[PDB]
Amino acid sequence: HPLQVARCTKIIKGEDAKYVINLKQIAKFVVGLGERVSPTDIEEGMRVGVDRSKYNIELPL
Amino acid sequence: HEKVTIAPLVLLSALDHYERTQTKENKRCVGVILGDANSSTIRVTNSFALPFEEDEKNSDVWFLDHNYIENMNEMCKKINAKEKLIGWYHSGPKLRASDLKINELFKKYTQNNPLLLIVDVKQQGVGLPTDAYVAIEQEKTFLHLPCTIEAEEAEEIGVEHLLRIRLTNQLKSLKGLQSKLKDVVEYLDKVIHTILGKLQDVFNLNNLQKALTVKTNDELMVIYISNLVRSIIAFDDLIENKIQNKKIQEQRVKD
Amino acid sequence: SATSGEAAALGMGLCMLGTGKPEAIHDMFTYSQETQHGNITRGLAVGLALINYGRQELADDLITKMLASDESLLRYGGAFTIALAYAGTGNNSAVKRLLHVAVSDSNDDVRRAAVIALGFVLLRDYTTVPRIVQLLSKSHNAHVRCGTAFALGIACA
């Protein structure tokens, strides 16, 4: 299922299990602290993505 | 010098602990002010009470827990980081001998000069229901700093929503000489000059204005010149409205 | 009690109608300032208004205590105390007191309850009723027009 835009809207949790990587020019974010791999759902599932800009350590999805 | 700025949040908070604890005249509620004493402007953004017990039989007997002092100051840091220990406040109309012995307690954890505050629930006479004083030694020497009240934008406006000159100025000015006269007579019989020397400095400084009396009347006439011109402008509208009122009456007769 | 206790204050005032007794005046008034409840005070305020009927100047002792209190709940029912005692033959000083409360006080419910009490005094002569509420019929506050509608309809019904 191709998805060319991976972004959330006003999602803040905690510290850990926050993520919300935004590819849009406004409010970009990155996730550090080692490697984190999830089988299906990383944070919100669904729109989780990377596309053209690789953000840090997350390959798998 | 320095000035004490008491926010309305602090003044109203100290009045709440008095009624809820059912404090009578035999007890005085003690509390801790929080703010920044570093600059010349001392602002208190937070206040809280403490389990204080007063004993009138012995002025050297007071119950204060230092554990609640350090814990509450540490737990309230999460709200604002600008809140530190600048001093403490207590209740009661007067300063007794028990207040002098408790001044050296908070001085251990206080860097700058601590600040003392007296909250009066009755507010009997003149203004300033809350008086601020500084504790410093060379013998304890207390100085009264100017007491002002300034709050944030939403705090000052919020007071106006909850509440939705010349004669008063002359009454308090006359009582200033009556209260000063009683302080001199009582001090005269108490000794039988240092305290009266400070009052003589203010009392001494058409007596001295005789040289400026001639120039004062000339300036008062110029002020009346502007008032006379503005009065004529208000008089022209009265004749203009009188003619305008007839135009309405002329329409009522024809119609 | 917030339900049955309110009817107790209103139920006693119905048996106390007429001249009444001075003992029930101080007991019902002191209990209002002792225990603080809105419906109980309104039950006492209406109750203290019912216990005084046709007393006129004889009820001025209780009326003064209601006007001196800053509580809006006591001043809400204070107009009905003047209305019932001064009902029928009116007094120039009593009417002046009812008109003075609706001016100085900023409470919308008290200004409304003050002008409604004017109808009970004017029940005999209804010619001056529409003339008093005519000036109050135009105002910036919405609650000013509220009380003038019923007070005009009490006598003219």
């Binding site: - | 109203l12 602990h17 203004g127 909850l162 010349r166 058409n206 509208d237 | -």
Partner: protein, 284 residues
């Protein structure tokens, strides 16, 4: 009747102080006191909680920090019953807090009459002091007293109410908040005399005397310009109208410029008289 929240003097000021840090950030607190339905509703003391990494959720409140603080409520006379949990949020059109969902549903289990308070403006401050809340209903809460009849409920003309993002549901069921205030005789005596404009008080004579007199020389020159532009407007007003009819879309022409020549004149003369009486008052 329903429960009409009465905000005390300290209850309103602490809510603005707890949410003082940041526009986007958020805090919480606990309302206290004891009250009975059909009138009495009161909040005695309020206190905040530290901001966690989860924002506002069921895990936001710290029972360890709450239990350690609760023991301090008893010795100070501050101990009361918890009537609810007040929060602070930047606010949205509907559901002002997107991270707050499962809190109130866990709060209604302990007490169904408990509410939650949030400060709406948060930099939007106006001076009507519009504050928002939420309370869940779901099944039940009916077969009881009259909730809507209290204050200006039974509404829905067009869609317009409050923020107008709500209509019927609001958050849930249209709890219909009612915000009033009640104070004792001592608290009302304070803010009346204390709060006016600023503090010169207790003596008005010499405080503003030197400040106003020093600028009186410049004030005399500035009030002259205001009169210069006064008659110039009235001169051109009657010069261009030979008709005395309306083609001029002038529906009220005169009263605007007449008040500008009156109210301004009425403002400038009274400040040069009433202040002049106390500007000397020297006698001996």
């Amino acid at each position: 009747t329903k429960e009409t929240v009465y905000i005390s003097s300290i209850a309103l000021l602490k809510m603005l102080k707890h949410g003082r840090a940041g526009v986007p950030m958020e805090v919480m607190g606990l309302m206290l006191g004891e009250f009975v339905d059909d009138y009495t509703v009161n909040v005695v003391d309020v206190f905040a909680m530290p901001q966690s990494g989860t924002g506002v959720s069921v895990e936001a409140v710290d029972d360890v920090f709450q239990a350690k603080m609760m023991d301090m409520l008893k010795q100070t006379g501050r101990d009361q019953m918890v009537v609810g949990w007040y929060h602070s949020h930047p606010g949205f059109g509907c559901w002002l807090s997107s991270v707050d969902v499962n809190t109130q549903k866990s709060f209604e289990q302990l007490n169904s009459r408990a509410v939650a308070v949030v400060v709406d403006p948060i930099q939007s401050v106006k001076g009507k002091v519009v504050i928002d809340a939420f309370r869940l209903i779901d099944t039940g809460a009916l077969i009881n007293n009259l909730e809507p009849r209290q204050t200006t409920s039974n509404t829905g003309l067009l869609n317009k109410a409050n923020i107008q993002a709500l209509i019927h549901g609001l958050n849930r069921h249209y709890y219909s908040l009612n915000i009033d205030y009640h104070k004792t005789a001592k608290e009302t005596k304070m803010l009346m005399n204390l709060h006016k404009e600023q503090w010169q008080s207790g003596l008005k004579m010499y405080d503003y005397e030197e400040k106003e007199e020093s600028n009186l020389a410049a004030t005399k020159s500035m009030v002259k310009i205001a009169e210069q532009y006064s008659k110039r407007i009235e001169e051109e007003k009657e010069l261009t109208e030979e008709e005395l009819k309306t083609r001029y879309v002038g529906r009220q022409d005169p009263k605007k410029h007449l008040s500008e020549t009156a109210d301004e004149t009425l403002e400038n003369n009274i400040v040069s008289v009433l202040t002049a009486g106390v500007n000397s008052v020297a006698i001996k």
